[PDB]
Design a protein around this ligand. Structure first.
Ligand SMILES: CSC[C@H](NC(=O)COc1cccc2cnccc12)C(=O)N[C@@H](Cc1ccccc1)[C@H](O)C(=O)N1CSC[C@H]1C(=O)NC(C)(C)C
Lengths: 99, 99
């Protein structure tokens, strides 16, 4: 697919057989998803963006699928406004920026 | 260019006769740079992201070159962790996400 940037590049993801919307973000190094209770093991972590830092739980090896493409890796869960797909998963689906 | 995302998408920008590095950021609506003097008149604005809300100065109709592609648009200057080129200027240079 090719996604223009007139609007925010929000797509559907599936994690644990539920669909969510998420922003595809080349500016994020990590993937941050809204609070949910996954089974599995986590570590505490702190991530920093524009206004400062928030606390998140880090889960490793989560499979998500982004517009039909599977990716597996580290997901951070915390109180974000929006679900963020960062470069750790975008590489696995083969995403590029082109101009 | 087609830019992969194995690394952060940093590019060189020319703004106000300086050269700077900035990240091409599809998760950002607007463009925020670190503290600088830009010619022109400005308005206080608030923006937010992970961690909260910051105040910035807004300069309208600033010419910037992103890898030799001109864009003339709003630039916000403020206490940012990284220089972000956001969707407001990424559309002008015809940037898309592809996978
Ligand atoms: C122009 S700078 C402000 C920008 N925010 C936006 O464009 C969108 O803002 C918002 C949209 C909707 C609801 C919001 C609620 N509260 C705050 C901001 C909101 C922004 O910070 N975008 C970031 C992503 C984002 C969007 C919306 C909420 C929160 C984060 C950026 O793309 C990124 O990846 N950055 C910018 S600094 C480092 C990095 C980053 O935050 N990294 C992570 C996500 C912490 C790993």
């Amino acid at each position: 697919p090719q996604i223009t940037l007139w609007q925010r590049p929000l797509v559907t993801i599936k994690i644990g057989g539920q669909l969510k919307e998420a922003l595809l973000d080349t500016g994020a190094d990590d993937t941050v998803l809204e609070e949910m209770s996954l089974p599995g093991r986590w570590k505490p972590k702190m991530i920093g963006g524009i206004g400062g830092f928030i606390k998140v739980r880090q889960y490793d090896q989560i499979l998500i699928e982004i517009c039909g493409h599977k990716a597996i890796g580290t997901v951070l869960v915390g109180p974000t406004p929006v679900n963020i797909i960062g470069r750790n998963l975008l590489t696995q689906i083969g995403c590029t920026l082109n101009f």
